[PDB]
Design a protein around this ligand. Structure first.
Ligand code: FZO
Ligand code: MG
Ligand code: MG
Length: 261
């Protein structure tokens, strides 16, 4: 019967979904035995860089959810000098965990998840954010939909277990040692994974030349023919290494793959 109070109301902790650095996310019930997610950040030690990333996340989450229901909802929050509590709509599960168990995706459901992710990413681009590190873990499944959680700022957390990648990074991020085009690359890797059941360079299991493969022009990604050729076309347009020739989000929204059927 571990509990959390937040701006008046009490919540029972059903379990800890995940953790990350100084954060924790709990699946909880309110007094009306309704389910929610609560994120907790122990601010006790945390530099002004960490503090500000979390303050920025909360502001954008509060702003953005008026413009799109593909952004996870922030219902209430409590913030002091010691801690943060955020009450949010709780997802059934994150998309990474969900992919890693499913055999094969229903084609109409892949198309629908795809529209969901485009809308969400589109929404954050309109308000001046480039995620830059998109991956399946950033999307939750709720009400048969995909909703975005992470904005790039704030430290990513990891699902917890009761025991004890880089496949999505855009090429121009590797050569950065970054624009809305970088999120379309990462979205194409997810859709590609949803189509061919595998990430473009998911087999180059050694990292340094996984990276090398990604930035290498005369390394070619394979697009086996498939029934839905509009989907073959989406993937080929997303996965162009040259950012300036890569398809954009506004264009992807006008594409037959999302507009027909
Ligand atoms: C039942 O609930 C869930 C369960 C699971 N998993 C993962 C595998 C095993 C399992 O059962 C994953 C997500 C949810 N639902 C959920 N998860 C959130 N954070 C997770 C933090 C760890 O990495 C993935 C996301 C938030 C969030 C934030 N921040 C605001 N709402 C949220 N809803
Ligand atoms: Mg068990
Ligand atoms: Mg295990």
């Amino acid at each position: 019967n571990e509990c959390i109070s937040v701006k008046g109301r009490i919540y029972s902790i059903l379990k800890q979904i995940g953790s990350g650095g100084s954060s924790k996310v709990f699946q909880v019930l309110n007094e009306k035995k309704q389910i929610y997610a609560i994120k907790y950040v122990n601010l006790e030690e945390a530099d002004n860089q960490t503090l500000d990333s979390y303050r920025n996340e909360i502001a954008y989450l509060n702003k953005l959810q008026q413009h799109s229901d593909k952004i996870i909802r922030l219902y209430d929050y409590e913030i002091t000098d010691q801690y943060i509590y955020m009450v949010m709509e709780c997802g059934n599960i994150d998309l990474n965990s969900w992919l890693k168990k499913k055999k094969s995706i229903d084609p109409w459901e892949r198309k629908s998840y795809w529209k969901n992710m485009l809308e969400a990413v589109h929404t954050i681009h309109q308000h001046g954010i480039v995620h830059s590190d998109l991956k399946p873990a950033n999307f939750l499944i709720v009400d048969g939909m995909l909703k975005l959680i992470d904005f790039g700022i704030a430290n990513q957390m990891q699902p917890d277990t009761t025991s004890v990648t880089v496949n999505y990074m855009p090429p121009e991020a590797i050569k950065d040692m970054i624009s809305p085009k970088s999120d379309v690359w990462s979205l194409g890797c997810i859709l590609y994974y949803m189509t061919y059941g595998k990430t473009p360079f998911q087999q180059i299991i050694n990292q340094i030349s996984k990276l090398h493969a990604i930035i290498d022009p005369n390394h070619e990604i394979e697009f086996p023919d498939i029934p839905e050729k509009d989907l073959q076309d989406v993937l080929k347009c997303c996965l162009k290494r040259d950012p300036k020739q890569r398809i954009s989000i506004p264009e992807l929204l006008a594409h037959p793959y999302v507009q027909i059927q």
